[PDB]
Design a protein around this ligand. Structure first.
Ligand SMILES: CCCCCCCCCCCCCCCCCC(=O)OC[C@H](COP(=O)(O)OCCN)OC(=O)CCCCCCCCCCCCCCCCC
Ligand SMILES: NC(=O)c1ccc[n+]([C@@H]2O[C@H](COP(=O)([O-])OP(=O)(O)OC[C@H]3O[C@@H](n4cnc5c(N)ncnc54)[C@H](OP(=O)(O)O)[C@@H]3O)[C@@H](O)[C@H]2O)c1
Ligand code: SF4
Ligand code: SF4
Ligand code: SF4
Lengths: 176, 318, 152, 38, 57, 309
């Protein structure tokens, strides 16, 4: 359909034009709002007082990585070379080679933490359900020699909290 | 000990102009819905001791391209005519008694803009060059709006001194009778001293940063402490020239008490604006003075001249 | 003797408690910088007043992606800043370039161009791991200007 | 089990910043020359 | 109209650098990965260059 | 073993170490090892933040920092244990109010000529100066020619180096002049006689090392560094005013880091051009650089535009 805005004409009669000459010359407008709508300061401030208080999130949040393990640990990753092949940024790097018993596992697993674009494509391709984006924004170290991760940085970083992780998926896994 | 009455003035004021900068962002804080500098204080009241000390540690570069002889005599001012102007200003007892002194402000109101033209030119090219030129041009066209509407009332009080101007406002708060003028006494000092709604001189929007752009932490405390030594004075004036208190030959002290609970309300006006209104685009900025502000100010002068004469009113002075 | 090391509980507490950060808007990451100065998480008034001119700053901040044609601009601006300067990159594109890291017209990494100090990792860092990236930099002044004059 | 007891931090140099390394076995296995006899 | 016939064997110069004369390209029909029997990965004549050293970082 | 091409993010098989490497010279060498690939372990004394302006020098995981004192015989033994070549630029100007300066050219260059020799470094290197002669001169210039004698005993293979008065970008040699806005230029000592020395440009010296850094076949065999042509005039002090058209300091200021009314004034006029028989440069070359052309760059003053020289 339509509408027309800013289409109006002044009335042009001496009952009006005072009302527009009691405005220009006496400032009866322009004190209407910012004489007032500004104050209106008397509302409670809204601030999350940071070092202590913190704000909301959701169980589907994304962040620092992990590699779980079952009960008594198997290093849940089977090195099926997938979370590697859907990765848009191509951070992941994986090198398998048959472990002594003959069950296969990894050797090098490196997520670069600069390239990773935080998809949620590597949480959703792993069929054996290993690699999982943690909900901890712990980060920010002082040397780029660092953020590159090896395998045996990840596991700890994913065994430091599994009380966080293992209780999110069981909220979220019923939807997908 | 007359020398210890002076130095008791220059020092105790540099604390206000310091601790204004804090109440700058608390009051302007809760307009935004938030709290003001908080973490460091505990209340924040301790912020400005940490800020005064970061600058003078922080290295004061000069442009390789500057003329150093001007790059000093200019700021060696922005802190004089700001601290001299305070001298003859009754509260209630002014340090000096100047016969005709009211006129002496305009002497020192007129001689500061000749410290802008130096600095912005002293340094270098087009952000402070033609950018410090055309803030000259607006600063001198808001005097003719001024000296007249200062001269109006002085027909209504009799003389040029300030000891009479407490007597005449006795039981009449001089803002009734000329309330049309009083408005224009306000938009002037806000337009002349480069504050919020006509903001252009110091740049944010129209340019990068006006006139401050070159000075690093070293000199730039002075201006940032000079520009706030005018603003709390004209506003510590307006309220001796309009909203009068009642002298008390007995408890002088209750004069100033009730006097800073006015001049300190009044000031909190250039902060209560700055949250609110936008800028003027330098055409509209002067283009609204000649056409609009001025014709009245003449017309009223033809009025406050006759009103005493036409009522046998003529105020008792020479 | 001991006066110096007690003096640096002043000057090394002054420079950390008032910062005048420049910012670079370039790319997505700029908006999750704004919301640090919006009232929720309120950047200013926690000690750090927001943007000033290039000359008056201390901590510049790099958001966004740095192409070829922006490099000649940055390296110049980083200079003019006064002494006590730092560089805190943020976002997954100042760390080695997000993606675009294989492109032709993106510099790879923005450490290459300047001596960067603190990092933060992810398309937009969540407006949180920003401030917890600064409460690293206000804790990264434990340094002392003693023990240069006063040892050697 | 298979999870920690107390905690750690993200620290800048603790002294321990972890500074990653390579996790793999060698590559080409260069030849050894023969010993003392001609 | 300026039709101006002539013959000069088309060549172009300056856009790449030294990789004009250093290398030798190759034009070959891909061979069908043999672990599977799908015959559809054939049929287009591609080209691909010589391989130079990849080292370790 | 060297791989690939020398651009960056390459190997080229040499480790290194560079002691000092904060002030004028050392910063300007490592910058030539943050290119051709290396492992440059740069230690440093007291300075946490003054070393940052360096870091975008090696690519990533190349240069790596440690902390050391140097009168502790361990601090030099913890680093070098893994190294190939190790050069040494250490030492400075004026006697410190703390370090008595006597053996800091004697004990320090030996203190790092401790287990370095033992632990199996190789191609160890040290610095000398073209003008240092064990005859009596000059209070600072002396103790430097002691190292050529005293220290050369240890590590029979050195290839210890002997360059001239050098002019860099941020250097203090030719910059003591033109800072002389003052009661007037007064030459040393008010005589136009023996100026000037062999003013080689800082690139060529810092391209000498890395040309000897795997040379090969220069070890024990010391070299000295030719200047350009040829000796020079008094005009050098006029030349300054011909074109000029007339770390870890403090927070506020430094009490004393002076012009030193001492060796400083007499160290600049000591001249003594010395033995040609040292190989010493083109052999290690190929480099030699003039003055007249390269002295505009480092000199820029309050005209900043006009030259017409
Ligand atoms: C950058 C560093 C180098 C600069 C350092 C020095 C800078 C000095 C700058 C001077 C700026 C202020 C000068 C303004 C003069 C104002 C004088 C004045 O208006 O005083 C008013 C008063 C009037 O007298 P009245 O009140 O009518 O009668 C009293 C009867 N008992 O008058 C009186 O009471 C009598 C006057 C007594 C004062 C003697 C004259 C003083 C004025 C001399 C100023 C010299 C000019 C200096 C340069 C000015 C440049 C702006
Ligand atoms: N070959 C030449 O042409 C020539 C000319 C002039 C002087 N020299 C001498 O040859 C070398 C060239 O030095 P330079 O050009 O790089 O200037 P420099 O400013 O002396 O550089 C020396 C660096 O090492 C530091 N240092 C001083 N004493 C030290 C010590 N005992 N132990 C460890 N570090 C020390 C200095 O301060 P920090 O301790 O804070 O690091 C500085 O960082 C020096 O020994 C110099 O005295 C040579
Ligand atoms: S997690 Fe899924 S994808 Fe990542 S490696 Fe183990 S199996 Fe392959
Ligand atoms: S996180 Fe996002 S980017 Fe990093 S790997 Fe998984 S998908 Fe690819
Ligand atoms: S990564 Fe950070 S910078 Fe690169 S695009 Fe996503 S947001 Fe903008």
């Amino acid at each position: 359909t339509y509408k027309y805005v800013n289409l109006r004409e002044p009335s042009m009669d001496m009952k009006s034009v005072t009302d527009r000459a009691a405005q220009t010359l006496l400032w009866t407008e322009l004190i209407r709002g910012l004489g007032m709508t500004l104050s209106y300061l008397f509302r409670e401030p809204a601030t999350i007082n940071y070092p202590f208080e913190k704000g909301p999130l959701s169980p589907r949040f994304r962040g620092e990585h992990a590699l779980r393990r079952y009960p008594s640990g198997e290093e849940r990753c089977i090195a099926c070379k997938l979370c590697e092949a859907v990765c848009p940024a191509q951070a992941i790097t994986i090198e398998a080679e048959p472990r002594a018993d003959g069950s296969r596992r990894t050797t090098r697993y490196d997520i670069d933490m600069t390239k990773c674009i935080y998809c949620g494509f590597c949480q959703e391709a792993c069929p054996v359900d290993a690699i999982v984006e943690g909900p901890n924004f712990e980060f920010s170290t002082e040397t780029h020699e660092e953020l590159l991760y090896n395998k045996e940085k990840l596991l700890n970083n994913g065994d430091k909290w599994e009380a966080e992780i293992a209780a999110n998926i069981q909220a979220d896994y019923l939807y997908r | 000990m007359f020398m210890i009455n002076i130095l008791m003035l220059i020092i105790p004021i540099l604390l206000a102009v310091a601790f204004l900068t804090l109440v700058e962002r608390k009051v302007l804080g809760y307009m935004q819905l938030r709290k003001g500098p908080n973490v460091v204080g505990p209340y924040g009241l301790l912020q400005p001791i940490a800020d005064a000390i970061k600058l003078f540690i922080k290295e004061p570069l000069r442009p390789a391209t500057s003329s150093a002889s001007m790059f000093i005599l200019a700021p060696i001012m922005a802190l004089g005519l700001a601290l001299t102007m305070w001298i003859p200003l009754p509260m209630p007892y002014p340090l000096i008694n100047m016969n005709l002194g009211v006129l002496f402000m305009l002497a020192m109101s007129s001689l500061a803009v000749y410290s802008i033209l130096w600095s912005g030119w002293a340094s270098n090219s087009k952000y402070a060059l033609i950018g410090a030129l055309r803030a000259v041009a607006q600063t001198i066209s808001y005097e003719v709006t001024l000296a007249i509407i200062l001269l109006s009332v002085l027909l209504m009080s009799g003389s040029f001194t300030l000891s009479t101007l407490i007597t005449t406002q006795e039981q009449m708060w001089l803002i009734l009778p000329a309330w049309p003028l009083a408005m224009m006494w306000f938009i002037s000092t806000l337009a002349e001293t480069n504050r919020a709604p006509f903001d252009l001189t110091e740049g944010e929007s129209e340019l990068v940063s006006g006139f401050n752009v070159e000075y690093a932490a070293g000199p730039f405390a002075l201006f940032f402490m000079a520009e706030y030594a005018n603003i709390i004075m004209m506003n510590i004036f307006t309220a001796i020239l309009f909203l009068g208190t009642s002298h008390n030959p007995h408890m002088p002290e209750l004069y100033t008490i009730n006097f800073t609970i006015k001049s300190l309300l009044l000031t909190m006006s250039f902060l209560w604006i700055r949250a609110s209104y936008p800028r003027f685009r330098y055409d509209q900025l002067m283009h609204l003075l000649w056409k609009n502000f001025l014709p009245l100010t003449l017309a009223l002068c033809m009025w406050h001249v006759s009103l005493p004469i036409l009522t046998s009113g003529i105020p008792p002075q020479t | 003797e001991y006066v110096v090391a007690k003096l640096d509980d002043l000057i090394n507490w002054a420079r950390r408690s008032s910062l005048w950060p420049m910012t670079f808007g370039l790319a997505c990451c700029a908006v999750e910088m704004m919301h640090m100065a919006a009232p929720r998480y309120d950047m200013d008034r926690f000690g750090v007043v927001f943007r000033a001119s290039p000359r008056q700053s201390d901590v510049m901040i790099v958001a966004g992606t740095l192409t070829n044609k922006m490099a000649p601009a940055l390296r110049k601006v980083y200079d003019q800043m006064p002494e006590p300067r730092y560089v805190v990159s943020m976002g997954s594109c100042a760390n080695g370039g997000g993606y675009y890291h294989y492109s032709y017209s993106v510099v790879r990494g923005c450490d290459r161009i300047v001596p960067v100090d603190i990092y933060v990792p992810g398309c937009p860092p969540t407006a949180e791991a920003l401030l917890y990236g600064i409460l690293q930099l206000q804790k990264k002044i434990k340094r002392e200007k003693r023990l240069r004059i006063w040892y050697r | 089990k298979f999870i920690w007891t107390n905690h750690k931090f993200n620290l800048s140099g603790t002294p321990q910043q972890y500074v990653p390394y390579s996790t793999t076995r060698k590559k080409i296995q260069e030849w050894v020359p023969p010993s003392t006899p001609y | 109209i300026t039709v101006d016939e002539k013959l000069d064997i088309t060549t172009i110069t300056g856009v790449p650098e030294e990789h004009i004369k250093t290398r030798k390209a190759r034009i070959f029909v891909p061979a069908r990965n043999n672990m599977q029997s799908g015959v559809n990965n054939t049929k287009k004549w591609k080209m691909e260059f010589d391989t130079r050293e990849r080292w370790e970082n | 073993i060297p791989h690939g091409k020398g651009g960056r993010s390459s190997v080229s098989g040499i480790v290194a170490t560079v002691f000092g490497a904060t002030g004028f010279l050392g910063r300007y060498v490592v910058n030539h090892l943050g290119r051709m690939g290396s492992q440059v372990i740069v230690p440093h004394r007291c300075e946490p933040y003054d070393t940052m302006h360096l870091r975008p020098m090696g690519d990533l995981g190349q240069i790596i920092f440690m902390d050391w004192n140097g009168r502790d015989k361990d601090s030099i033994r913890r680093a070098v244990e893994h190294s190939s070549v190790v050069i040494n630029l250490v030492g400075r100007e004026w006697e410190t109010q703390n370090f008595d300066f006597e053996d800091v050219f004697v004990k320090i260059p030996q203190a790092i000529a401790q287990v370095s020799k033992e632990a199996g470094v190789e191609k160890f290197i040290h610095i000398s100066h073209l003008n240092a002669d064990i005859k009596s001169s000059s209070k600072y210039l002396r103790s430097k020619a002691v190292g050529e004698k005293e220290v050369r005993e240890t590590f029979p293979e050195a290839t210890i180096i002997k360059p001239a008065e050098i002019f860099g970008r941020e250097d203090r040699f030719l910059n003591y002049f033109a800072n002389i806005r003052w009661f007037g230029g007064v030459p040393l000592i008010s005589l136009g006689k023996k100026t000037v020395k062999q003013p080689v440009y800082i690139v060529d010296v810092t391209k000498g090392i890395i040309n000897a850094i795997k040379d090969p076949d220069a070890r024990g065999k010391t070299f000295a560094f030719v200047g350009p042509s040829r000796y020079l005039l008094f005009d050098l002090v006029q030349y300054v005013f011909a074109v000029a058209h007339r770390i870890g300091r403090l927070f506020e200021i430094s009490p004393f880091e002076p012009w030193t009314t001492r060796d400083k004034v007499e160290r600049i006029h000591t001249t003594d051009k010395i033995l040609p028989h040292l190989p010493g440069l083109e052999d290690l070359g190929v480099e030699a650089t003039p003055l007249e052309l390269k002295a505009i760059e480092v000199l820029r003053r309050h005209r900043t535009y006009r030259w017409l020289s």
